[PDB]
Design a protein around this ligand. Structure first.
Ligand SMILES: *Cc1c(COP(=O)(O)O)cnc(C)c1O
Ligand SMILES: *Cc1c(COP(=O)(O)O)cnc(C)c1O
Ligand SMILES: [Cl-]
Ligand SMILES: [Cl-]
Lengths: 278, 278
């Protein structure tokens, strides 16, 4: 079961999930010209909705998209949650597109579906990853705002193509690397690794997305006395680590048990990461 | 006036242009996971449709998208052309999306609208361009098929953001450059320049789109005795040229009269380019 709400004349309107909602001329379809958020629905609630709404505002600023505001998104989330089963974990995505062009109103909607069994299983049992190069220097995106570094966009054909290429090798997911070999991020997730008693993540100044799940782990780790660091790591760091995870709003913490075909353990560190994220 | 046809149960179905046609869960919207072609409609005909359909097949191969075949696209084009005025120049776009996922059928449609007055005016009176870096080495995409070099995709948020950044400087359009400074292409067009009595264009091995308009110019130039070359040019070549154009299916030949604020003439070469493309 799926549910959709569209923002129409200053209100959220529920529409059947199978019914078309975007026209052929919507720039979100034709040019991938829009932004999104992926929000976890757990026990019929959105525990981290505000974190996603703040970043939605930031992505929309980067693309010069007029956003309808927090109250509008909360009305749309409420509309899709109305009849959602508490026992069924969901992914609520929020889309904002440029619409028919800058002048006509942007298209805003909410769409809710179950988290699939295979994503839940990756959370339970972990993932293999392939390292793929993005071809950009680590320092380049900071000086090239047209590359939309730091924006969560609808233009993810490359993100998905990287995952299909990894699937062809036998891997579940991807860690992107800069031209120099620096770790960037996953196509839809943030890389964290444990070494020397510290939790590490790559720096945002490389033009990656600031991940909300990573930020929440780091905040909890500080309160608990687990040191954290922003570290310009390489693939060598993932092999040498005590543990590696990909973090994201919906899948959550996926332990990385294989890097480019090199199997690795987690030093029994995943338990404390999961307790902190709970 | 606009017209849309959707591919439904092995036939083209005309729908009103204002009516929604894609659901919230279409991967073409949510991930920009699809390909397109932009086809000129002139005097109620598509003079170069076959060129676009061959490349559509190539883009779909790069993204692993099952394509409905030439006959299907010609039925969809015919459907949108049915009541189109011969006196009104049009842009017919063809979209193929991954649909609800690899397993459910891809979404295919055709959408036709007038070429806007401002695009026609760029064809008539020419354009200013800004040079912007893509941050990738010229040779990188050839070894990184997940970057979808050479595919005409729906994931063009960066393409459009580059144009808005150029608009902010006072420029009409963009020429992308490799990390080394090599000319790549426009966000939606192919760069050609004249120097030493030769027509030049950048090589496709840099991961650019092979442009159909550029190819057709080069073929006609050979028949007419105007030498052509694939040349790994830089921005220096555009300043030093006798003439510069951006070429594309819909806008056609747009003479570049300004590069990064440096005004330039065309050596009265545009006339022969236009005669060859006619
Ligand atoms: C969404 C996303 C993430 C993960 O961020 P969360 O806020 O933890 O969901 C990381 N990188 C990319 C590229 C993403 O799109
Ligand atoms: C469509 C397009 C072109 C132009 O190709 P034509 O076949 O001449 O329309 C060039 N570069 C990019 C990136 C394009 O999308
Ligand atoms: Cl996502
Ligand atoms: Cl285009």
């Amino acid at each position: 079961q799926r549910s959709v709400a569209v923002w129409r004349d200053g209100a959220a309107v529920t529409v059947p999930a199978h019914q078309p909602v975007v026209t052929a001329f919507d720039l979100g379809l034709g040019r991938g010209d829009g932004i999104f958020e992926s929000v976890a629905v757990v026990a019929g609630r959105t525990p981290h909705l505000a974190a996603h709404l703040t970043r939605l505002t930031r992505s929309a600023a980067l693309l010069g998209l007029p956003a309808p505001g927090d109250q509008a998104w909360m009305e749309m989330v409420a509309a899709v949650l109305a009849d959602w089963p508490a026992a069924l974990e969901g992914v609520c995505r929020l889309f904002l597109t440029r619409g028919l062009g800058d002048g006509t109103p942007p298209t805003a909607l909410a769409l809710l579906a179950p988290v699939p069994a295979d994503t839940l299983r990756q959370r339970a049992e972990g993932i293999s990853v392939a390292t793929l190069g993005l071809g950009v220097p680590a320092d380049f995106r900071a000086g090239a705002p047209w590359l939309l570094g730091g924006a969560k966009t609808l233009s993810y054909a490359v993100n998905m193509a990287a995952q299909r290429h990894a699937h062809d090798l036998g891997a579940d997911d991807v860690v992107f690397t800069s031209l120099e070999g620096r770790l960037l991020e996953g196509p839809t997730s943030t890389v964290v690794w444990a070494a020397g008693g510290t939790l590490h993540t790559p720096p945002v100044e490389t033009g990656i997305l600031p991940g909300t799940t990573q930020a929440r782990l780091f905040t909890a780790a500080a309160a608990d006395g687990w040191p954290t660091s922003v570290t310009p790591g390489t693939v060598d760091d993932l092999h040498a680590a005590d543990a590696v995870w990909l973090l994201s709003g919906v899948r959550g913490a996926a332990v990385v048990h294989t890097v480019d075909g090199v199997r690795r353990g987690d030093g029994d560190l995943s338990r404390r990461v999961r307790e902190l994220l709970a």
